[PDB]
Amino acid sequence: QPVAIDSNFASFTYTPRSLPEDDTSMAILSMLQDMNFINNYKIDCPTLARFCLMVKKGYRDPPYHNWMHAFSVSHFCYLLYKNLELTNYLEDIEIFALFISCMCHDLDHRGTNNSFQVASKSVLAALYSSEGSVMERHHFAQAIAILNTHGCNIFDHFSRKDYQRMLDLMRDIILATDLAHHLRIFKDLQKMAEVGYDRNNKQHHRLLLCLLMTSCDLSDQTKGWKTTRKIAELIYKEFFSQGDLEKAMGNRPMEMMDREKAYIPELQISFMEHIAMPIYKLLQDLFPKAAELYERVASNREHWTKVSHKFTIRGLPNNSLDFL
Ligand SMILES: COc1cc(C(=O)N2CCC[C@H](c3ccnc4ncnn34)C2)cc(OC)c1OC
Ligand SMILES: [Mg+2]
Ligand SMILES: [Zn+2]
């Protein structure tokens, strides 16, 4: 199969979660073919196949941080290649690392965040806490463990030099999915939207790849409302289990993690306005064809305000007040 999968597939309006979970591995392959990476770097196919599937299995099934997330982040990366040029901004090998990274970026996520790993004193906190980005270093570790499983090393044929460059890229890109990181380099991304991008400046390449990894990581918000609301549910279900476990542990979770304080409308708005929209504003400034994505997140930002009134109980819940 080539992108025979759906007519909208290369479109920003297409929703990869619509794709049956059983057909996602194959869709990965179809995107690597259409961007022409498999013939570029002459990837061994049965090897790549095994890799794809070790990646898929490397994900667990919490509400949001699961394989269909990873698939869907990957899909958006593909859409950036189709709809933005990117090749005039980044070396092909960087775009291919961006896509493989997308696939691998939340591997073996346990449905909880970095501070919780530290709070609960998990094995992952012991390993990585002192360097930061606990989960993201673990995600990167898992990719590496897969690449060094027999028959899964999709780069075993790369030049020593090219293989090294794939490891650095994947590492840096996976690391950049920590939203803490993004928020730290936001002023650096801003300098690269005032002074303009410099195709020869290596730090601009590095910074651009981070912007687009995030852009992919948050790409559920660029779809229609139906999707945005469903994904909100999945996210808070996941966050509220974390809050619950933290109370049990005798700690106060963040407002957004605590199901007795979380006001979903405010939290979504704030996320849309101050995290997600400025990300796609920077994407638009760097790429004019990225404008619709900004407009799509702003639509969704305005639509939560259109529906927040609904979170105040007017009338009776159910027809009962026994909940007081
Ligand atoms: C640093 O500030 C925030 C971080 C996160 C977060 O941890 N996220 C990582 C897990 C997927 C989340 C996500 C992904 C896609 N769409 C999302 N909508 C709301 N959260 N959200 C973001 C969420 C926030 O609000 C919901 C934040 O401020 C309001
Ligand atoms: Mg992540
Ligand atoms: Zn992610």
Short mmCIF file of C-alpha atoms and ligand atoms in Angstrom, two decimals:
data_model
loop_
_atom_site.label_atom_id
_atom_site.label_comp_id
_atom_site.label_asym_id
_atom_site.label_seq_id
_atom_site.Cartn_x
_atom_site.Cartn_y
_atom_site.Cartn_z
CA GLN A 1 0.00 0.00 0.00
CA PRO A 2 0.93 3.64 -0.69
CA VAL A 3 -0.84 6.80 0.57
CA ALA A 4 -4.43 3.93 -1.22
CA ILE A 5 -4.93 4.43 2.55
CA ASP A 6 -7.04 7.62 2.23
CA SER A 7 -7.41 10.61 -0.07
CA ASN A 8 -7.13 13.09 2.82
CA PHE A 9 -4.06 11.34 4.26
CA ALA A 10 -1.57 14.11 3.35
CA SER A 11 -4.03 16.78 4.46
CA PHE A 12 -3.92 18.79 7.70
CA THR A 13 -7.64 17.99 8.14
CA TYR A 14 -7.08 14.21 8.20
CA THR A 15 -7.27 12.48 11.61
CA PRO A 16 -4.86 9.55 12.09
CA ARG A 17 -6.82 8.29 15.10
CA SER A 18 -9.57 7.44 12.59
CA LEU A 19 -7.17 4.81 11.31
CA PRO A 20 -7.75 1.36 12.84
CA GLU A 21 -5.00 0.44 15.31
CA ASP A 22 -4.33 -2.76 13.29
CA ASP A 23 -3.45 -0.69 10.18
CA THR A 24 -1.05 1.81 11.86
CA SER A 25 2.24 -0.16 11.51
CA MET A 26 1.62 -0.38 7.75
CA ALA A 27 0.81 3.35 7.65
CA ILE A 28 4.18 4.14 9.20
CA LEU A 29 5.81 2.25 6.35
CA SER A 30 3.63 4.07 3.82
CA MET A 31 4.82 7.47 5.10
CA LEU A 32 8.50 6.48 5.02
CA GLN A 33 7.97 5.41 1.39
CA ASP A 34 6.16 8.61 0.35
CA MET A 35 8.86 10.89 1.86
CA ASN A 36 11.21 8.45 0.04
CA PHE A 37 13.36 7.75 3.12
CA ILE A 38 13.45 3.94 2.60
CA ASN A 39 15.21 4.25 -0.76
CA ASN A 40 17.23 7.34 0.23
CA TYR A 41 19.03 5.59 3.03
CA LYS A 42 18.26 2.18 1.59
CA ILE A 43 16.67 0.87 4.78
CA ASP A 44 16.41 -2.91 4.96
CA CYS A 45 12.63 -3.54 4.94
CA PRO A 46 12.15 -6.64 7.15
CA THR A 47 14.49 -4.91 9.60
CA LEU A 48 12.41 -1.70 9.47
CA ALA A 49 9.26 -3.76 9.81
CA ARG A 50 10.54 -5.41 12.98
CA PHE A 51 11.60 -2.01 14.33
CA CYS A 52 8.17 -0.50 13.70
CA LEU A 53 6.55 -3.36 15.59
CA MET A 54 9.01 -3.33 18.49
CA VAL A 55 8.20 0.40 18.73
CA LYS A 56 4.41 -0.25 18.71
CA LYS A 57 4.77 -2.93 21.44
CA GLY A 58 7.11 -0.62 23.37
CA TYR A 59 4.06 1.51 24.19
CA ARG A 60 1.64 0.77 27.04
CA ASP A 61 -2.04 1.64 27.15
CA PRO A 62 -2.64 4.52 29.55
CA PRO A 63 -5.39 6.83 28.40
CA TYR A 64 -3.32 9.33 26.30
CA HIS A 65 0.40 8.30 26.21
CA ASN A 66 -0.08 5.17 24.09
CA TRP A 67 0.89 3.95 20.62
CA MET A 68 -1.95 5.81 18.84
CA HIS A 69 -0.39 8.94 20.29
CA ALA A 70 2.98 8.01 18.86
CA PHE A 71 1.44 7.14 15.48
CA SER A 72 -0.44 10.43 15.44
CA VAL A 73 2.62 12.53 16.30
CA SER A 74 4.49 10.70 13.52
CA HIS A 75 1.61 11.40 11.10
CA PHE A 76 1.82 15.11 11.73
CA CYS A 77 5.56 15.02 11.06
CA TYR A 78 4.79 13.50 7.73
CA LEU A 79 2.18 16.27 7.10
CA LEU A 80 4.82 18.90 7.72
CA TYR A 81 6.98 17.38 4.96
CA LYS A 82 4.07 17.36 2.48
CA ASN A 83 2.59 20.76 3.23
CA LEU A 84 5.62 22.76 4.28
CA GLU A 85 8.69 22.33 2.13
CA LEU A 86 11.19 21.89 5.04
CA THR A 87 13.81 20.49 2.64
CA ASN A 88 14.79 24.14 2.04
CA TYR A 89 15.24 24.52 5.81
CA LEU A 90 16.58 21.12 7.01
CA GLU A 91 18.82 18.32 5.74
CA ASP A 92 16.81 15.21 4.72
CA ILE A 93 18.62 13.12 7.38
CA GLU A 94 17.34 15.56 10.01
CA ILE A 95 13.72 15.11 8.80
CA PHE A 96 14.09 11.34 8.86
CA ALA A 97 15.43 11.53 12.45
CA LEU A 98 12.48 13.78 13.30
CA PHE A 99 10.07 11.09 12.10
CA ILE A 100 11.81 8.14 13.74
CA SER A 101 12.00 10.23 16.94
CA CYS A 102 8.26 10.94 16.72
CA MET A 103 7.65 7.18 16.63
CA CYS A 104 9.86 6.58 19.61
CA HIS A 105 9.31 9.69 21.74
CA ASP A 106 6.96 8.42 24.50
CA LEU A 107 8.14 4.77 24.60
CA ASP A 108 7.14 2.88 27.74
CA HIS A 109 5.32 5.91 29.16
CA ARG A 110 3.56 4.80 32.36
CA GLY A 111 0.90 7.52 32.19
CA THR A 112 2.65 9.79 34.71
CA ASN A 113 5.01 12.80 34.48
CA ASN A 114 8.58 13.63 35.46
CA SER A 115 7.96 15.02 38.96
CA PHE A 116 5.84 12.00 39.82
CA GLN A 117 8.75 9.72 38.93
CA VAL A 118 10.80 11.71 41.38
CA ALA A 119 8.05 11.91 44.04
CA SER A 120 7.42 8.16 43.96
CA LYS A 121 11.19 7.43 43.74
CA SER A 122 10.86 5.16 40.69
CA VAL A 123 13.79 3.32 39.13
CA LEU A 124 13.66 5.97 36.38
CA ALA A 125 14.11 8.80 38.90
CA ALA A 126 17.15 7.07 40.35
CA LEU A 127 18.66 6.78 36.86
CA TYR A 128 17.87 10.23 35.41
CA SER A 129 16.55 12.73 37.97
CA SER A 130 19.83 14.61 38.38
CA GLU A 131 20.06 15.35 34.65
CA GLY A 132 16.32 16.12 34.22
CA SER A 133 13.66 15.08 31.75
CA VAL A 134 13.32 11.72 33.43
CA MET A 135 10.72 10.17 31.10
CA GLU A 136 12.34 11.56 27.92
CA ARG A 137 15.74 10.10 28.79
CA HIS A 138 13.93 6.82 29.39
CA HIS A 139 12.09 7.15 26.05
CA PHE A 140 15.46 7.63 24.36
CA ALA A 141 16.94 4.70 26.29
CA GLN A 142 14.17 2.42 25.01
CA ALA A 143 14.72 3.42 21.39
CA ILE A 144 18.35 2.58 21.84
CA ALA A 145 17.49 -0.79 23.40
CA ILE A 146 15.30 -1.58 20.42
CA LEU A 147 17.98 -0.53 17.89
CA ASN A 148 20.35 -2.93 19.64
CA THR A 149 17.89 -5.82 19.57
CA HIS A 150 18.84 -8.40 16.94
CA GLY A 151 17.28 -7.68 13.54
CA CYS A 152 15.83 -4.30 14.55
CA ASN A 153 18.77 -1.95 13.80
CA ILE A 154 17.39 0.08 10.94
CA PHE A 155 20.72 2.03 10.83
CA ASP A 156 23.22 -0.90 10.95
CA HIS A 157 24.23 -0.12 7.32
CA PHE A 158 24.73 3.64 7.83
CA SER A 159 28.17 5.16 7.61
CA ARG A 160 29.80 5.40 11.04
CA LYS A 161 29.41 9.17 10.55
CA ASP A 162 25.70 9.01 9.56
CA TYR A 163 24.87 6.56 12.36
CA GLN A 164 26.42 8.87 14.96
CA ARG A 165 24.44 11.77 13.52
CA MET A 166 21.19 9.73 13.80
CA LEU A 167 21.87 9.04 17.51
CA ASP A 168 22.56 12.73 18.31
CA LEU A 169 19.49 13.89 16.46
CA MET A 170 17.11 11.36 17.99
CA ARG A 171 18.53 12.08 21.43
CA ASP A 172 18.14 15.87 21.09
CA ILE A 173 14.68 15.60 19.50
CA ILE A 174 13.32 13.12 22.02
CA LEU A 175 14.73 15.33 24.74
CA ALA A 176 12.98 18.39 23.30
CA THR A 177 9.52 16.81 23.90
CA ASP A 178 9.86 17.67 27.59
CA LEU A 179 7.62 20.75 27.65
CA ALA A 180 9.98 22.08 30.37
CA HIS A 181 12.68 22.18 27.75
CA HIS A 182 10.52 23.93 25.14
CA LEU A 183 9.53 26.57 27.68
CA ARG A 184 13.28 27.13 28.43
CA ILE A 185 14.29 27.64 24.77
CA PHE A 186 11.21 29.58 23.78
CA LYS A 187 13.16 32.90 23.82
CA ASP A 188 15.81 31.22 21.59
CA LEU A 189 13.11 30.11 19.15
CA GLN A 190 11.85 33.76 19.27
CA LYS A 191 15.28 35.15 18.24
CA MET A 192 15.02 32.81 15.22
CA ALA A 193 11.70 34.41 14.25
CA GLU A 194 13.09 37.98 14.53
CA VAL A 195 16.56 37.59 12.92
CA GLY A 196 15.17 35.10 10.37
CA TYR A 197 16.29 31.52 9.83
CA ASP A 198 19.83 30.83 8.59
CA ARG A 199 20.09 27.63 6.52
CA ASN A 200 23.85 27.47 7.35
CA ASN A 201 23.63 28.04 11.12
CA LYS A 202 23.69 24.64 12.85
CA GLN A 203 22.01 25.87 16.07
CA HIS A 204 19.05 27.11 13.93
CA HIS A 205 18.70 23.59 12.52
CA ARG A 206 18.85 22.23 16.11
CA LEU A 207 16.26 24.80 17.29
CA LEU A 208 13.97 24.29 14.30
CA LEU A 209 13.79 20.53 14.84
CA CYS A 210 12.67 21.13 18.48
CA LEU A 211 9.92 23.50 17.36
CA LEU A 212 8.57 20.86 14.97
CA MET A 213 8.85 17.94 17.44
CA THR A 214 6.67 19.92 19.84
CA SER A 215 4.40 20.96 16.96
CA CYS A 216 3.90 17.28 16.28
CA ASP A 217 3.66 16.35 19.99
CA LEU A 218 0.73 18.81 20.39
CA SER A 219 -0.80 18.19 16.97
CA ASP A 220 -4.17 16.96 18.33
CA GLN A 221 -5.10 20.63 18.86
CA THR A 222 -4.75 21.42 15.15
CA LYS A 223 -7.67 19.08 14.23
CA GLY A 224 -11.43 19.76 14.53
CA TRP A 225 -13.25 20.18 17.85
CA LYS A 226 -14.46 16.58 17.95
CA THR A 227 -10.89 15.31 18.31
CA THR A 228 -9.72 18.08 20.69
CA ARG A 229 -12.49 17.26 23.19
CA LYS A 230 -11.94 13.51 23.09
CA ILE A 231 -8.17 14.00 23.62
CA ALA A 232 -8.88 16.39 26.48
CA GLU A 233 -10.81 13.58 28.17
CA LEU A 234 -7.98 11.12 27.67
CA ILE A 235 -5.44 13.57 29.02
CA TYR A 236 -7.27 14.41 32.23
CA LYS A 237 -8.23 10.79 32.89
CA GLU A 238 -4.51 10.13 32.81
CA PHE A 239 -3.63 13.27 34.88
CA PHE A 240 -6.30 12.56 37.52
CA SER A 241 -4.98 9.02 38.18
CA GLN A 242 -1.69 10.65 38.87
CA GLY A 243 -3.31 13.15 41.29
CA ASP A 244 -5.12 10.32 43.06
CA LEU A 245 -1.87 8.36 43.55
CA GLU A 246 -0.10 11.47 44.86
CA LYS A 247 -2.78 12.13 47.50
CA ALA A 248 -2.41 8.49 48.62
CA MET A 249 1.32 9.20 48.92
CA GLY A 250 0.49 12.25 51.08
CA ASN A 251 1.29 15.01 48.57
CA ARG A 252 -0.69 17.83 46.95
CA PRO A 253 -0.78 17.36 43.18
CA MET A 254 -0.93 20.33 40.84
CA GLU A 255 -4.33 21.88 40.25
CA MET A 256 -4.34 20.29 36.80
CA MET A 257 -3.55 16.85 38.35
CA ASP A 258 -6.11 17.09 41.22
CA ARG A 259 -9.65 16.12 40.21
CA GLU A 260 -11.28 18.14 43.00
CA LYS A 261 -9.64 21.41 41.89
CA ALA A 262 -9.09 20.89 38.15
CA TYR A 263 -11.36 23.25 36.27
CA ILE A 264 -10.93 21.80 32.75
CA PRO A 265 -12.13 24.89 30.78
CA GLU A 266 -9.65 27.31 32.38
CA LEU A 267 -6.82 24.74 32.12
CA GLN A 268 -7.56 24.08 28.42
CA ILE A 269 -7.86 27.77 27.55
CA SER A 270 -4.58 28.57 29.30
CA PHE A 271 -2.88 25.70 27.52
CA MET A 272 -4.32 26.77 24.14
CA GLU A 273 -3.50 30.47 24.57
CA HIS A 274 -0.09 30.44 26.22
CA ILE A 275 1.57 27.15 25.31
CA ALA A 276 0.08 25.81 22.13
CA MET A 277 -0.86 28.91 20.06
CA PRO A 278 2.53 30.65 20.46
CA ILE A 279 4.12 27.39 19.29
CA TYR A 280 2.12 27.52 16.06
CA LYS A 281 2.61 31.32 15.80
CA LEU A 282 6.36 30.64 15.68
CA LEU A 283 5.59 27.87 13.16
CA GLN A 284 3.63 30.32 10.97
CA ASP A 285 6.37 33.02 11.20
CA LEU A 286 8.90 30.39 10.05
CA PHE A 287 6.48 28.95 7.42
CA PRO A 288 3.59 30.92 5.85
CA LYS A 289 1.73 27.71 4.74
CA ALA A 290 1.58 26.73 8.44
CA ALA A 291 -0.99 29.52 8.97
CA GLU A 292 -4.12 27.29 8.94
CA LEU A 293 -2.71 25.28 11.86
CA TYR A 294 -2.52 28.45 13.94
CA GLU A 295 -6.08 29.34 12.86
CA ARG A 296 -7.20 25.79 13.79
CA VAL A 297 -5.82 25.95 17.34
CA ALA A 298 -7.25 29.47 17.83
CA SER A 299 -10.69 28.17 16.70
CA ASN A 300 -10.44 25.46 19.35
CA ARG A 301 -9.18 28.06 21.87
CA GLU A 302 -12.31 30.14 21.20
CA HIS A 303 -14.63 27.11 21.26
CA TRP A 304 -13.79 26.09 24.88
CA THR A 305 -14.85 29.60 25.98
CA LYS A 306 -18.01 28.90 23.97
CA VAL A 307 -18.59 25.79 26.14
CA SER A 308 -17.15 26.56 29.60
CA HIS A 309 -20.49 27.90 30.89
CA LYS A 310 -21.50 24.22 30.62
CA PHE A 311 -19.22 23.28 33.58
CA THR A 312 -21.42 25.19 36.06
CA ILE A 313 -24.33 22.97 37.11
CA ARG A 314 -27.60 24.71 36.17
CA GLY A 315 -30.81 22.95 37.16
CA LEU A 316 -30.20 19.50 38.67
CA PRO A 317 -27.36 17.08 37.78
CA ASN A 318 -29.70 12.81 36.98
CA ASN A 319 -32.40 14.83 38.85
CA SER A 320 -30.71 14.41 42.32
CA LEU A 321 -28.83 16.60 44.86
CA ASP A 322 -27.61 13.67 46.96
CA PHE A 323 -24.09 14.56 45.67
CA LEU A 324 -23.91 17.38 48.29
C1 LIG B 1 3.67 23.22 31.29
O1 LIG B 1 2.26 23.51 31.19
C2 LIG B 1 1.33 22.52 30.90
C3 LIG B 1 1.77 21.23 30.60
C4 LIG B 1 0.85 20.24 30.28
C5 LIG B 1 1.39 18.90 29.99
O2 LIG B 1 1.98 18.42 30.92
N1 LIG B 1 1.30 18.28 28.82
C6 LIG B 1 2.03 17.05 28.56
C7 LIG B 1 1.02 15.92 28.38
C8 LIG B 1 0.09 16.25 27.23
C9 LIG B 1 -0.54 17.63 27.41
C10 LIG B 1 -1.40 17.96 26.23
C11 LIG B 1 -1.14 17.49 24.93
C12 LIG B 1 -2.00 17.83 23.87
N2 LIG B 1 -3.08 18.59 24.08
C13 LIG B 1 -3.29 19.00 25.35
N3 LIG B 1 -4.28 19.77 25.83
C14 LIG B 1 -4.07 19.94 27.16
N4 LIG B 1 -2.94 19.27 27.56
N5 LIG B 1 -2.50 18.71 26.37
C15 LIG B 1 0.52 18.71 27.66
C16 LIG B 1 -0.50 20.48 30.30
C17 LIG B 1 -0.96 21.76 30.61
O3 LIG B 1 -2.32 22.02 30.62
C18 LIG B 1 -3.31 21.02 30.33
C19 LIG B 1 -0.04 22.78 30.91
O4 LIG B 1 -0.48 24.04 31.20
C20 LIG B 1 -1.89 24.39 31.16
MG MG B 2 6.34 12.78 26.03
ZN ZN B 3 4.26 12.73 23.26
#
